[PDB]
Amino acid sequence: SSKWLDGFRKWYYNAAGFNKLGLMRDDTLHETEDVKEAIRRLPEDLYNDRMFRIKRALDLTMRHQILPKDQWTKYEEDKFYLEPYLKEVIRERKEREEWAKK
Amino acid sequence: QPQDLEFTKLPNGLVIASLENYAPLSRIGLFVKAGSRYEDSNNLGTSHLLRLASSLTTKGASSFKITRGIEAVGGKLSVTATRENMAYTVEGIRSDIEILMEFLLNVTTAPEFRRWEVAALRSQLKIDKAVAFQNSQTRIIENLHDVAYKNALANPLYCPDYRMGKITSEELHYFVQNHFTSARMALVGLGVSHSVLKQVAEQFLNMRGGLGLAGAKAKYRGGEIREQNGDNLVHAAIVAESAAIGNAEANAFSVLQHLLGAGPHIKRGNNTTSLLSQSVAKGSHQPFDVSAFNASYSDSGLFGIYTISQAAAAGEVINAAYNQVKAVAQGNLSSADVQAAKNKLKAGYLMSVETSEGFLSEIGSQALAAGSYMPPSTVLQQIDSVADADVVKAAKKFVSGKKSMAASGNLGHTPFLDEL
Amino acid sequence: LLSQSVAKGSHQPFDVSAFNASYSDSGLFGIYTISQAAAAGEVINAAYNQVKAVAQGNLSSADVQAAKNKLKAGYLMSVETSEGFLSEIGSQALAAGSYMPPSTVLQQIDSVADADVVKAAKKFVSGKKSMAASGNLGHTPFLDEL
Amino acid sequence: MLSVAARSGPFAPVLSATSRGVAGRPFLCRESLSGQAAARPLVATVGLNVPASVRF
Amino acid sequence: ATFAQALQSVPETQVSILDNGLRVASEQSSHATCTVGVWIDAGSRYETEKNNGAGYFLEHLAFKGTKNRPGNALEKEVESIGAHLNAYSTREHTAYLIKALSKDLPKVVELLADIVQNSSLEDSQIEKERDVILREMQENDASMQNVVFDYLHATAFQGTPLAQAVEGPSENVRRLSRTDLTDYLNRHYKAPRMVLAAAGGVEHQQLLDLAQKHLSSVSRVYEEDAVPGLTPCRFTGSEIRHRDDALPLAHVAIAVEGPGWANPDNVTLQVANAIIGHYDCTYGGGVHLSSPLASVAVANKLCQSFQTFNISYSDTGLLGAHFVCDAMSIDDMVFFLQGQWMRLCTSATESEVTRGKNILRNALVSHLDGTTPVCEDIGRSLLTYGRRIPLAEWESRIQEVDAQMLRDICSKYFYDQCPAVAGYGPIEQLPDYNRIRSGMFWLRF
């Protein structure tokens, strides 16, 4: 079934360990030109919430400890918030490279 | 080969129109009746951002796709912002009319209005206003319309200084979802036949049916905004309420406007037999520029006197021009000059007719105002039916109406409504 | 009376005052209303109807005496600071050129009676007006609408 | 009476601007001016690849 | 109907020669208006330095005075009809247009006959319009585009009459009298150098009969057998830089000599001008604009505008771009514009060629929409090209342009040829002429 794959994804979440330092799925991405052009697109509350989560992850990795078990971000509490902007940025850059091909 | 201007109304309430000129340039103009007069004080200046939002991301066509598509097909997409009604005109190559027409349809009927593109366009609003206000006259006309109406025509056509940084995507979507309606707008075409225009109107245009807010009747206010600018030339304009488009007095007010003179006919000439430039130059040796000013809308028009002068003798040119209109309000006029005014108005209407951009604007304005086309020969007949006493009645209505004044420059000798 | 006759009809936060500014040739008297943008028409029309009630003469002589004591006390607040006293005799010696005593100013304010207040309210409501406004202006009334 | 703060109480800082200085084309021709007036009202054109034009 | 059938269904140009060497040309259409016009092959090239501003003086002075109808009687007879009267002059060709209704052309052609050979030049009108021309030349200095093009015409052509602007210098207009102006009118306003023009509601038999009736018997012979001749103006690649730091915006224009009028290279370099593109800050295309210099210009906010120009005169051309920028961004704008010119000369793609072909095709039909640029191109084409070139023939010579021909003709005219550089702003971050010439060739080639 798919519950073995969901258990493997939960085990990969807890083995990647960026649920330990208060982060969701899209705070850990490499900020290239596409991720920066998508990171400008968010509303101000989500942008400041992402920057507070990044600052708390930087602070607690500097102090070398982690959040507790209640303060960890769960897999069901994970929101893929950057994905409807990043899919639009990736599709727009694909259309731009298609017009550069033409 | 120009057989007829086909003109019919779709049963939702849409005007569709097309003319086959067998023209190598195809010009399709959409004409919404949502200018800068249909918003209120809460949504001020969003018509400027909707005017600048021709190249944003739409549904089914991106911003990069729409910019590369319009200027790689070859034509233009541009707007026209009269305070009553707005126009989205597109000109282009006749071989590929369809991509341009669906591109303007995706501009109008299904926008997206993304927040980051509006935040990018907020600086372009300030840049477009700071370039467009280098003309001194449009500030006077904007202050004139701010003075001479109470609400629902007193909103400025350009955006105010504070709303740049405040106009939201929810505000633009509310303005589009209320006031961009198929029962409200029209779609006219030059060089394009009726069949593909009716197919596009059935395809992507006949969705909206809710007419939205219809305005608030544009009540007259009257007063003065008199700012100072530091230029040597004062720009002043004294204006009263006149009749609306479709009445029996707007033609007489336009005959009176071309009787007092509004056009530089002989370029770098005296503009001699116009009555205002006659009666100012009888008394003043100063450099000046005096003209009439007719601003006709669908609710109540605005007829007035425009003076540009040096600031040391503003009272002489303003009082001489107003004494000329007080002279013509008593019937002191010649019927040969009324015939010259009528021929100047017929010439000015055919100047509006003769270019296909101007023909597209005239067909769109007649389509939004009336819903049926009126031929220019009947326009010449209606101008020729203006009596000699009707412009005396129009000057009497201008004198007896409540005044309104917009002026800017050094204001040491500029007179007031008590002195006029 | 402005604050009572505005607050009897309005419930939003506001500030209705009247201000006087008399220069050497001509002066201004008027109503300054700070309101929210929705109820400002009711605020301005209720304040103008209150000054209409003063102009027809709906007045209490104890309230006129309280106005006289308020003006005498406010002039003593202007006197009691040394920069205010220097400004007071600087404006007196500048414009008038003579220094009245503050007790003589109190005698003039006590000499002002009710019929002069009725006459000045009639003069303000019958004179030509001028209005300056700033804010969201969708419910701000015009001068012809007053 | 004859003062600035004695007339209006709270309005003395807004009608008395204190200042602590220390710490405590021009169209020059009549024939060239023919065309700068307003024949027809405010029309604004903003294009995609054409510049701004005002029809008067 | 397609583009080729639409241009074949464009109505034809009728051109006939009158008895005195006049050209009369009409384009009949369905407009109720008619513009009559007269185009004279006289400008700043055909005058010498003794009489510089005589063309501007005569284009001011032909309307206020007439031997037949003196004073303001021209203004009476014009505003009793409703005609407008434009009068534009260039460095080689001057004109007198009109704009009236189709029923009034017997009065109109008689009035345009009374303008150009019967203009009385009153001396009080000469003194008053002398004061008008000095105040207009004082007011023209605030506009920067015309004085930057005048500076480029001064610095590109030296010792030759394309240096002289159409305004004329202040000494050379205060030193103009009646006899020098009527010498210029008696020598340069000749009917072999004259074409009448019409654009709709017009029969050519009516124009031939009316121009035979009124505007015939005009000169045709020079006085002392003193025939002027056209000379090729020497293009000197030079520079000029009027540094005025108090003006807020720098107007810098770089041009190189282009083909002239009669070459078929002109369709190729106006295609290249369409690929380079035009810009102003009111352009709403943004970062997604197809012109590459415009997209990097609004990507780094370097310029407020650039206009590319192909100003072609007989035997010669200026061909370049006028950009207005701020003071800090000039060197980046010269680097990106010479990089875009060198990319168009070195590696031009067929997508760019069909984009510039479509932009030039749209601009050529959008100019020839209206009746007054139909009259402008019929008078200018009857003076320059020898006929009005039909727009199907311009369509054909646009259609033969591809990437290899565009790259070869661009590499002939732009690649490593000496620029003419003009500027009238904060001109400190303009590079010097050796750096501009070093940018004019690519080491990557």
Side-chain angles (χ1 to χ4, degrees):
Chain A
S1 177
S2 92
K3 70 113 196 173
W4 143 256
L5 201 166
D6 183 72
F8 207 93
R9 286 219 155 112
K10 263 224 185 203
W11 175 24
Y12 212 89
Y13 208 36
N14 301 326
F18 65 102
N19 49 349
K20 253 172 269 216
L21 321 165
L23 302 177
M24 286 150 187
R25 216 268 325 271
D26 300 309
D27 312 293
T28 171
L29 253 53
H30 165 48
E31 300 99 317
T32 169
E33 280 157 333
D34 323 309
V35 181
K36 205 157 305 294
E37 199 39 68
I39 216 62
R40 214 196 82 258
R41 318 276 253 260
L42 297 105
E44 187 247 331
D45 38 8
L46 265 180
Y47 190 40
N48 296 327
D49 160 76
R50 151 165 213 278
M51 206 80 74
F52 170 65
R53 271 187 330 244
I54 270 176
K55 191 153 147 143
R56 108 176 304 178
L58 266 284
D59 158 66
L60 290 159
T61 325
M62 148 186 82
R63 226 193 326 274
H64 284 60
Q65 311 115 332
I66 45 155
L67 283 320
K69 166 144 293 183
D70 321 306
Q71 218 93 59
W72 285 349
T73 84
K74 326 224 166 295
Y75 200 74
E76 268 60 44
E77 223 162 22
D78 206 342
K79 35 182 66 55
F80 322 116
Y81 63 97
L82 206 39
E83 206 77 21
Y85 308 130
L86 194 41
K87 181 67 63 62
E88 187 84 11
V89 162
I90 273 164
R91 192 206 43 84
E92 174 178 323
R93 203 204 22 100
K94 276 306 190 286
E95 187 143 312
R96 193 195 323 269
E97 290 268 3
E98 176 259 307
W99 212 277
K101 269 179 205 328
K102 164 166 166 275
Chain B
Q1 316 201 300
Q3 48 270 14
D4 209 334
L5 175 58
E6 282 236 8
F7 213 95
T8 188
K9 169 164 301 200
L10 292 196
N12 76 17
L14 182 44
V15 168
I16 201 92
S18 46
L19 178 72
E20 264 306 285
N21 317 48
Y22 286 0
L25 182 77
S26 93
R27 298 199 39 107
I28 293 178
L30 173 135
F31 275 82
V32 284
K33 208 191 302 174
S36 284
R37 82 151 267 198
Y38 281 101
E39 65 260 28
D40 47 77
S41 82
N42 263 48
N43 46 2
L44 255 182
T46 180
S47 165
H48 197 187
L49 249 191
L50 178 56
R51 141 152 56 103
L52 255 72
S54 318
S55 325
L56 299 191
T57 306
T58 68
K59 262 202 298 296
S62 167
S63 47
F64 186 73
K65 169 70 187 314
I66 201 147
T67 319
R68 293 319 183 85
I70 290 298
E71 77 203 54
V73 156
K76 97 183 147 34
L77 152 73
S78 39
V79 307
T80 289
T82 291
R83 269 177 199 273
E84 216 186 287
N85 58 336
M86 254 174 30
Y88 288 86
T89 190
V90 163
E91 72 161 79
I93 293 193
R94 213 201 158 96
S95 72
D96 44 354
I97 298 170
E98 174 69 35
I99 166 173
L100 300 150
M101 170 178 42
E102 82 162 48
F103 258 39
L104 81 83
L105 255 285
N106 282 14
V107 153
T108 301
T109 70
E112 208 142 334
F113 288 133
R114 319 264 195 86
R115 155 200 66 246
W116 47 86
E117 260 150 355
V118 168
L121 227 52
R122 276 166 221 267
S123 90
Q124 201 73 29
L125 223 55
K126 167 136 87 142
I127 276 173
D128 185 37
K129 182 150 107 62
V131 167
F133 263 18
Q134 306 282 291
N135 234 345
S136 154
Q137 41 168 17
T138 169
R139 153 77 79 197
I140 271 67
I141 295 304
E142 186 256 7
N143 267 345
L144 192 151
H145 288 123
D146 187 74
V147 165
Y149 282 103
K150 284 198 156 106
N151 51 319
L153 195 40
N155 304 330
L157 173 79
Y158 289 92
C159 178
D161 303 358
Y162 69 101
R163 299 268 343 153
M164 28 192 81
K166 291 202 203 337
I167 305 155
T168 80
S169 179
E170 169 56 47
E171 222 166 20
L172 276 143
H173 265 287
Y174 181 83
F175 190 34
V176 153
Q177 207 249 329
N178 279 126
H179 289 176
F180 270 29
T181 325
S182 98
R184 167 165 313 272
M185 73 183 67
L187 177 60
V188 300
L190 254 289
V192 193
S193 168
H194 214 177
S195 81
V196 77
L197 262 184
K198 249 198 170 134
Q199 263 157 11
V200 157
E202 172 59 14
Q203 235 160 39
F204 313 120
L205 183 63
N206 61 329
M207 33 210 60
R208 313 252 193 90
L211 272 311
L213 196 83
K217 210 39 196 315
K219 281 158 297 203
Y220 190 80
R221 199 242 277 183
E224 274 114 317
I225 280 300
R226 288 179 78 258
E227 81 262 21
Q228 309 229 349
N229 200 278
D231 312 331
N232 58 326
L233 304 127
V234 79
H235 298 244
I238 303 122
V239 53
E241 182 252 304
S242 35
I245 283 175
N247 216 59
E249 266 84 9
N251 306 278
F253 265 106
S254 211
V255 170
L256 190 54
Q257 182 220 356
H258 275 121
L259 179 61
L260 301 176
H265 279 25
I266 297 193
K267 195 218 185 176
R268 263 163 281 102
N270 304 346
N271 277 195
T272 308
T273 186
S274 56
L275 255 60
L276 288 184
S277 284
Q278 250 162 8
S279 200
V280 165
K282 294 215 177 161
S284 159
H285 307 147
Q286 204 84 239
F288 61 95
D289 172 40
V290 62
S291 97
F293 163 67
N294 202 285
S296 305
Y297 298 110
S298 168
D299 41 61
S300 88
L302 279 188
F303 179 56
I305 302 306
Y306 210 95
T307 58
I308 304 173
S309 44
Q310 311 277 302
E316 157 72 29
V317 50
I318 280 175
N319 264 312
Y322 192 80
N323 276 28
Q324 189 38 70
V325 197
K326 204 112 81 166
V328 80
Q330 301 320 292
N332 300 44
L333 85 177
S334 321
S335 310
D337 220 318
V338 188
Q339 275 302 314
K342 263 186 263 196
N343 284 35
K344 273 160 75 158
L345 179 55
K346 287 153 103 164
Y349 192 79
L350 290 177
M351 284 331 121
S352 298
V353 152
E354 55 161 12
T355 46
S356 192
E357 194 262 328
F359 202 22
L360 199 62
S361 164
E362 196 61 77
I363 286 166
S365 148
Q366 279 205 13
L368 283 185
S372 212
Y373 186 72
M374 154 162 81
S377 69
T378 60
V379 171
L380 308 174
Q381 188 214 43
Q382 273 321 107
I383 286 161
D384 203 14
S385 315
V386 170
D388 297 351
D390 271 297
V391 315
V392 173
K393 287 250 263 202
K396 275 273 299 294
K397 210 185 86 140
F398 167 73
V399 160
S400 194
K402 258 174 57 56
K403 301 272 157 305
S404 158
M405 189 153 176
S408 154
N410 189 20
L411 291 180
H413 326 95
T414 294
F416 291 87
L417 290 206
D418 180 75
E419 315 179 47
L420 290 160
Chain C
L1 296 200
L2 279 186
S3 203
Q4 301 168 238
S5 318
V6 168
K8 97 169 70 192
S10 317
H11 85 100
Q12 309 195 39
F14 69 100
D15 170 51
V16 173
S17 54
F19 85 107
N20 201 357
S22 278
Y23 304 111
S24 59
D25 316 329
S26 158
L28 292 183
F29 179 72
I31 318 170
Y32 185 27
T33 63
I34 311 169
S35 317
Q36 324 282 333
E42 320 170 88
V43 164
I44 284 157
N45 292 323
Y48 193 35
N49 285 322
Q50 176 51 53
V51 189
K52 280 268 200 326
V54 180
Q56 279 95 70
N58 204 24
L59 273 194
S60 322
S61 313
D63 197 25
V64 174
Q65 174 70 84
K68 286 188 318 258
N69 295 319
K70 268 183 269 168
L71 184 43
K72 284 195 288 204
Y75 170 65
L76 257 300
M77 305 334 178
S78 292
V79 157
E80 92 193 41
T81 165
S82 77
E83 53 99 19
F85 190 40
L86 179 131
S87 278
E88 181 71 64
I89 207 171
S91 286
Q92 275 172 283
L94 159 74
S98 51
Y99 178 60
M100 331 168 276
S103 70
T104 304
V105 181
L106 300 206
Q107 291 315 301
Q108 293 205 337
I109 297 312
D110 199 51
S111 310
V112 174
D114 291 48
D116 299 308
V117 188
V118 171
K119 164 185 51 162
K122 278 152 149 22
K123 160 147 184 271
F124 168 68
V125 78
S126 76
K128 179 147 67 88
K129 319 270 227 312
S130 95
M131 163 172 201
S134 148
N136 298 5
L137 282 195
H139 322 92
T140 288
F142 279 100
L143 198 53
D144 188 272
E145 287 150 6
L146 253 56
Chain D
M1 209 71 95
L2 287 110
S3 204
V4 52
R7 296 308 284 167
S8 36
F11 303 97
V14 308
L15 291 112
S16 94
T18 197
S19 202
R20 301 144 282 152
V22 303
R25 309 163 280 239
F27 296 98
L28 252 65
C29 171
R30 175 169 338 127
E31 325 297 276
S32 87
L33 250 178
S34 85
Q36 274 298 110
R40 308 243 70 175
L42 216 49
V43 164
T45 290
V46 173
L48 178 136
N49 65 324
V50 305
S53 316
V54 181
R55 167 247 187 187
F56 261 26
Chain E
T2 171
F3 219 153
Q5 225 268 1
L7 286 184
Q8 266 162 20
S9 161
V10 157
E12 87 284 335
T13 282
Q14 200 127 334
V15 163
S16 76
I17 305 294
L18 246 188
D19 215 358
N20 50 351
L22 203 79
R23 268 89 60 85
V24 284
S26 49
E27 176 116 346
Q28 194 162 351
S29 46
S30 322
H31 314 90
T33 54
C34 63
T35 74
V36 196
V38 47
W39 268 263
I40 313 154
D41 205 335
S44 300
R45 151 175 298 221
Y46 291 86
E47 45 86 11
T48 82
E49 187 49 42
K50 143 184 61 184
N51 32 63
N52 209 314
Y56 211 53
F57 221 115
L58 260 184
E59 99 165 348
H60 281 35
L61 201 36
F63 292 156
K64 313 190 144 131
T66 292
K67 159 75 200 80
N68 209 350
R69 336 194 187 275
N72 283 296
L74 252 56
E75 314 251 19
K76 297 326 194 277
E77 206 44 76
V78 152
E79 303 220 270
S80 280
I81 287 303
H84 295 63
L85 263 84
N86 203 8
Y88 82 109
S89 169
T90 54
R91 273 130 163 90
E92 230 188 327
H93 312 273
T94 187
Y96 300 99
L97 282 80
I98 209 157
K99 197 155 39 151
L101 314 178
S102 206
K103 315 149 49 195
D104 318 323
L105 195 137
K107 289 157 285 323
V108 171
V109 165
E110 176 166 80
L111 202 140
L112 217 71
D114 272 345
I115 283 173
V116 293
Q117 36 159 14
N118 271 345
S119 88
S120 148
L121 308 92
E122 286 118 11
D123 219 302
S124 87
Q125 209 46 249
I126 277 176
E127 163 199 311
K128 181 210 161 63
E129 288 218 278
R130 258 206 218 87
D131 226 321
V132 159
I133 286 167
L134 283 287
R135 290 226 307 274
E136 210 274 334
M137 283 167 18
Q138 283 297 319
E139 93 186 78
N140 206 267
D141 200 32
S143 211
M144 226 79 87
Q145 174 158 168
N146 34 57
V147 67
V148 152
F149 290 160
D150 283 328
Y151 279 179
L152 193 161
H153 283 90
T155 202
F157 303 100
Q158 292 168 357
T160 172
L162 250 61
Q164 309 166 252
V166 85
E167 309 298 298
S170 63
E171 176 158 71
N172 274 5
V173 54
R174 290 288 319 191
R175 281 202 316 179
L176 295 194
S177 58
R178 158 78 209 268
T179 178
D180 172 82
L181 279 168
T182 191
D183 163 79
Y184 180 69
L185 175 132
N186 225 317
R187 189 173 146 85
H188 283 48
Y189 271 24
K190 310 298 250 213
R193 307 219 307 247
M194 246 194 286
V195 48
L196 207 74
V202 161
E203 278 89 335
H204 210 58
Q205 194 53 50
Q206 207 189 357
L207 270 194
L208 200 145
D209 160 76
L210 219 55
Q212 163 82 11
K213 203 188 310 301
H214 301 152
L215 169 133
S216 99
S217 90
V218 185
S219 80
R220 179 184 28 73
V221 55
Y222 296 86
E223 312 146 10
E224 282 324 288
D225 263 9
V227 173
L230 83 171
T231 56
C233 272
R234 177 193 55 205
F235 181 77
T236 69
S238 86
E239 88 160 293
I240 199 171
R241 31 181 60 196
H242 194 150
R243 214 184 148 187
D244 175 281
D245 260 333
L247 278 154
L249 275 193
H251 290 248
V252 194
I254 282 74
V256 166
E257 199 183 22
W261 272 127
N263 298 333
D265 299 68
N266 243 329
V267 306
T268 298
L269 295 127
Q270 300 197 91
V271 160
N273 288 107
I275 309 183
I276 287 303
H278 35 96
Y279 189 59
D280 186 307
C281 265
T282 85
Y283 281 38
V287 58
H288 295 343
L289 262 159
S290 79
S291 306
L293 159 72
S295 49
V296 305
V298 81
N300 312 335
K301 294 172 290 293
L302 300 175
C303 83
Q304 272 215 20
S305 165
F306 48 90
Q307 153 187 170
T308 181
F309 46 87
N310 174 47
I311 317 187
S312 39
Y313 304 106
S314 168
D315 223 307
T316 180
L318 307 162
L319 184 35
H322 175 210
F323 42 85
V324 54
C325 315
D326 69 80
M328 283 326 259
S329 78
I330 297 173
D331 172 46
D332 310 33
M333 181 78 11
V334 192
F335 172 59
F336 288 148
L337 185 148
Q338 292 209 231
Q340 281 333 288
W341 275 346
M342 233 51 72
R343 206 166 57 72
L344 258 304
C345 282
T346 291
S347 38
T349 83
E350 316 271 2
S351 81
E352 298 186 328
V353 188
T354 176
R355 162 172 88 248
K357 264 193 310 163
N358 290 314
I359 289 297
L360 208 67
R361 228 174 281 113
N362 156 248
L364 271 205
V365 74
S366 174
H367 216 56
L368 297 200
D369 189 26
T371 59
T372 88
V374 160
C375 268
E376 159 215 318
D377 278 13
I378 206 166
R380 270 198 315 102
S381 280
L382 255 289
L383 273 179
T384 51
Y385 290 134
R387 46 152 192 288
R388 184 147 157 271
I389 314 281
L391 182 39
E393 212 174 50
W394 273 90
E395 168 89 20
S396 196
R397 263 185 301 286
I398 280 180
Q399 150 202 305
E400 315 303 66
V401 157
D402 66 335
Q404 195 37 63
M405 183 169 168
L406 166 75
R407 153 181 44 261
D408 274 339
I409 292 306
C410 172
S411 287
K412 194 142 44 64
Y413 287 76
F414 282 178
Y415 194 65
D416 206 52
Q417 311 281 331
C418 291
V421 174
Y424 179 48
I427 312 276
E428 200 44 79
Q429 207 143 353
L430 190 50
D432 199 7
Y433 196 82
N434 273 347
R435 280 278 275 274
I436 299 177
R437 268 274 333 156
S438 93
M440 213 44 101
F441 64 99
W442 259 4
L443 287 202
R444 304 117 201 87
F445 209 88

